[PDB]
Design a protein around this ligand. Sequence first.
Ligand SMILES: [Br-]
Ligand SMILES: [Br-]
Ligand SMILES: [Br-]
Ligand SMILES: [Br-]
Ligand SMILES: [Br-]
Ligand SMILES: [Br-]
Ligand SMILES: [Br-]
Ligand SMILES: [Br-]
Ligand SMILES: [Br-]
Ligand code: NA
Length: 129
Amino acid sequence: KVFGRCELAAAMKRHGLDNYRGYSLGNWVCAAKFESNFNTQATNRNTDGSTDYGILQINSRWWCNDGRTPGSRNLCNIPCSALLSSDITASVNCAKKIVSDGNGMNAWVAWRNRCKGTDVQAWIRGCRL
Ligand SMILES: [Br-]
Ligand SMILES: [Br-]
Ligand SMILES: [Br-]
Ligand SMILES: [Br-]
Ligand SMILES: [Br-]
Ligand SMILES: [Br-]
Ligand SMILES: [Br-]
Ligand SMILES: [Br-]
Ligand SMILES: [Br-]
Ligand code: NA
């Protein structure tokens, strides 16, 4: 599923992402924009053999099991495929764990490089929230 901008903001707020660990809704939406362009089915293979999955491109090295990332962990205790569902519950649950890991949303390199320190409010602007 390819979410619209405000549709995702609504879903993310519903699932309790609005200011989770101090991060405003606009941050999470911006992160999704540049990670997956709002597409739940996005995948991207890393050079280390790991793979990123879903709206927030959560990686198989630490967070999910895809059964093809030698020596990796599954800290979110889910199949990586669950992160590709049109229902973003698994992605949100897992993301809450990642951002609580110590380095905040810096865990998402696209967030740090493209969202961090920007007017993130713009991403939820005009939306009925
Ligand atoms: Br957009
Ligand atoms: Br919910
Ligand atoms: Br915001
Ligand atoms: Br594996
Ligand atoms: Br699993
Ligand atoms: Br599994
Ligand atoms: Br949803
Ligand atoms: Br959730
Ligand atoms: Br933080
Ligand atoms: Na894994």
